[PDB]
């Protein structure tokens, strides 16, 4: 009985297991309980606080995996395999887990909260790319990561109603971080100082926990990995949720009340099994239940919120990939596939747009497809591919990301932005995916440090840089290493100056406009094109 | 007769002519200078389309240019040699139906290729008498045989009842054809080659030599052409019948006037009194806007430009087409509130939005909106340098940038074969301020070579510079293509086509080729606005 492996938190008493990390020992506590299990009557409903529990609490495993579809597209490639859930679905999965040094940190620490990407529909704390050992061993973080329910069973609303009140996933994420202040001490992490990251939806989630009161006093910094609160996905309207939890309860066989009663008599797989039906158009990048604008967790639309708020004494690290948009074509562009070059002609380009931005009227349409051939090339197949990507990246990440980037700075908050620039080697994906949607997470938690992995040697030196931004901001709300002269400096990004630094295995370079031509017509033109039409 | 220079005596159909030996350069030139070609558009021949002028006896005195056909004269900056320049240098008259003949000096000996020369000024101006236009070196440098007529302008020229008698419109259009028609019976009398007859001109010029190509009966009257800064096509050339009836009616009422009784009205009223008023009669607030422009008639113009030129049958013509680097410069300083000859002109946003509506008039709220953001740097917008240069790229791009892409695009798809150009020499000799960069109208001085007039202090390289540039235009007046045949020394000026989209700098430098002319903006102006305005 290793005393380092054991905590007293307020629940009771759990045991942790030591882990092996290349440079040493980290305790790991694994599948910790935050909530009730939200089984039975508890579907669809606020998550409650786990019951106290007798003796020592088995720490040494991770729990069961939040129920979701499972991604069939290409069976056995390791490129979709790393994203699938790698522990038994279940409903009762309310758990999170604790990283720390060993032996365990001697003073207060800073500590870090990673909530998973996955649309809303996937994702699951115990993937291998999320594993916080590197970053506990090597730079004495304690790295906090949750379990939350997606899909149907964290995201189905019938708004206004007492049984679906929606964005319970969110209430799920909202009381692991009520956990973390409540405990995190015990195991020698800093309450006082707490920064959430997290990529794709799990920035999204970050992004609403900014823009939710009750959150704000569980962290004090933020870190959004290729995704934003505001943007066409990552929200829907009360009218629009109520029609997809509607439409979905029909197609299951099913007064608010009565309805859901009969959605929790059904078995968790009958509800997957007609999860992807509800959409109101052929799309991607598009996710059936996701959080809605409810007047309660939003108080407003994320839109209106970041537009008015007031972000004083607030850190943000924002950033994308190179390329956000390759990932997706393959999930329903006609055209795009992973076996090949993916070489497209015009007129599957502007059937790929009707898909990418599937909201888009003939006309808007049109002024996407505009934008975006180049005009010296208009049939290049190799543009036409690449332009399909960059639609689909912009739309959905890049000038949401900037948009917030500029209303956040403009309202005092302290913003850093970046771009990810280095194709991982050991990449499975073809070489036209370029750097795609999520490959910027096994950097950032530390991976080719584990020497088994095969990542290259200058890659394990990049991991070590990007880990050291990240912490270094955790700490002190500035990714800059402040005991390091020459970098050059990763300046603070500003409406005025728009600066922003590439990621890759060359030293920081400061870039200025973050698609600004682009985005311009993504933030400012095409919103005026369809509210006029 | 007996004591005249034997050289300087020339017959044409309407009878005998005296012209003026001059000096160029590098020797004499034989011009013959206001020759008539119709009976004076006068009287009851106002509005009316020109008949032919009636032979007459004795020596006809052709050594002096004659009258300039009545127009609005520029007073905004008097005094200044930068809008002097272009301004009536003869009488203004209603009698004005006049041309010019230079030869080398003594006339050719075999059949030479015939330069044609039409005058821009938006169609309400011009004069084939103006200094730019002097056909002297041409002539005694490169050989050629250079003519260039008047034909009337503004309401004298393009007021239009269309489908009435008294005023079908396009007569100024008409002018120009029948000194076409001259050109064919009488040029081999001057040792010109009515086979080979090629018309340039510049802006109105250039947009007037598109309209010939695009009508039938002027067809016939020559074999290629250049249109420098112009087209047929885009939103200042032509007016629908429907407003061109409108501003007709509206300038009738202005000097207080069934079409046959307004039109007889409007021929009692002076010249002047529809000069005072050719203005008054525009739907917005705008710049590179004219009141009386060439009509879709269904007759000259038997379809709108745009429908021409998409499917017309283009196998067998020529065509150089070009544009100068700053085509916008010039007219923001007639009527964009921020601009002025006197100052950088460094404007703020708001001039900026406000002079988008004044140079796009006819763009609703929507459209406006667009170019703002289309033409806006994203990093620096508010930054008065950027507004500025922005603010003359939008009416460059608008008006004669994008119109030529359309246009060389459109004929190369369709056969023809296409030369096209930018020329971005700034003459030293400019009086325009620096921010207006290389203005519109400032290639001409060049192609005419005046920089070989010692006298005219241009630099020695700009005296090379216009040699160069007389050499490709009479080249391709000579054979169809700019280049030297020999001459492989010198890199080549290859064709424009949709699938290279070629183009050459003309600077002092030798021939660089570009590729795509604005081809993402011209995007926008050509594929997407149109489309905006149907919604
Ligand atoms: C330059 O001159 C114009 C016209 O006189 C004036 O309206 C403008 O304000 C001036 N520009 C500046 C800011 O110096
Ligand atoms: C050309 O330069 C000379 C010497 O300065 C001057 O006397 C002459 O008037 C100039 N001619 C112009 C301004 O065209």
């Not at 040493?24 to 309980?33: D, E, H, K, Q, T």
């Not at 038994?88 to 720390?100: I, P």
């Not at 962290?219 to 609160?229: D, E, K, M």
Request: charged letters at 20%.
């Amino acid at each position: 009985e290793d005393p380092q492996l054991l905590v007293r938190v307020r629940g009771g008493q759990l045991r942790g297991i030591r882990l092996k990390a290349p440079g040493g020992p980290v305790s790991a506590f694994l599948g910790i309980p935050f909530a009730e299990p939200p089984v039975g009557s508890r579907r669809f409903m606020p998550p409650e606080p786990k019951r106290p529990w007798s003796g020592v609490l088995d720490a040494t495993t991770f729990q069961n995996v939040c129920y979701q579809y499972v991604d069939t597209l290409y069976p056995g490639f390791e490129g979709t395999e790393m994203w699938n859930p790698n522990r038994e679905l279940s409903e009762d999965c309310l758990y999170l887990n604790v990283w720390t040094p060993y032996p365990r940190p001697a003073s207060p620490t800073p500590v870090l909260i990673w909530i998973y990407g996955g649309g809303f529909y996937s994702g699951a704390a115990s993937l291998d790319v999320y594993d916080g050992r590197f970053l506990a061993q090597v730079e004495g973080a304690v790295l906090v990561s949750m379990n939350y329910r997606v899909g149907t069973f964290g995201f189905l609303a019938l708004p206004g109603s007492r049984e679906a009140p929606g964005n319970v996933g969110l209430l799920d994420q909202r009381l692991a971080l009520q956990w973390v202040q409540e405990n995190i001490a015990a195991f020698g992490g800093d309450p006082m100082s707490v920064t959430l990251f997290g990529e794709s939806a799990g920035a999204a989630s970050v992004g609403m926990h900014i823009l939710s009161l009750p959150s704000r006093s569980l962290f004090h910094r933020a870190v959004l990995q290729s995704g934003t609160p505001n943007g066409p996905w990552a929200t829907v309207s009360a009218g629009e949720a109520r029609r997809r939890a509607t439409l979905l309860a029909r197609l299951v066989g099913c007064n608010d009340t009565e309805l859901i009663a009969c959605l929790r008599t059904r078995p968790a797989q009958d509800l997957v099994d007609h999860e992807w039906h509800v959409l109101p158009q052929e799309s991607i990048f598009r996710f059936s239940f996701v959080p809605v604008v409810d007047g309660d967790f939003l108080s407003d639309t994320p839109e209106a919120l970041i537009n008015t708020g007031d972000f004083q004494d607030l850190q943000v690290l924002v950033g994308v990939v190179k390329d956000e948009g390759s990932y997706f074509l393959v999930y329903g562009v006609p055209g795009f596939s992973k076996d090949n070059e993916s070489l497209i002609s015009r007129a599957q380009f502007l059937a790929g747009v009707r898909i990418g931005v599937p909201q888009a009227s003939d006309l808007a349409a049109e002024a996407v497809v505009l934008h975006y051939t180049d005009w010296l090339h208009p049939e290049d197949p190799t543009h036409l591919r690449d332009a399909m990507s960059a639609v689909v990246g912009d739309h959905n990440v890049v000038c949401p990301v900037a948009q917030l980037a500029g209303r956040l700075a403009a309202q005092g908050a302290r913003v850093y932005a970046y771009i990810f620039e280095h194709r991982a080697s050991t990449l499975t994906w073809p070489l036209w995916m370029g750097v795609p949607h999520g490959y910027e997470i096994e950097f950032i938690f530390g991976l080719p440090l584990d020497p088994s992995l095969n990542y290259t040697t200058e890659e394990r030196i990049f991991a070590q840089r990007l880990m050291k931004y990240w912490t270094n901001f955790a700490r002190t709300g500035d990714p800059n290493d402040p005991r390091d002269s020459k970098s050059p400096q990763w300046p603070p990004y500003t409406t005025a100056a728009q600066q922003y630094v590439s990621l890759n295995l060359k030293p920081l370079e400061v870039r200025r406009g973050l698609r600004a031509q682009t985005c311009a017509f993504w933030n400012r033109f095409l919103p005026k094109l369809l509210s006029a039409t």
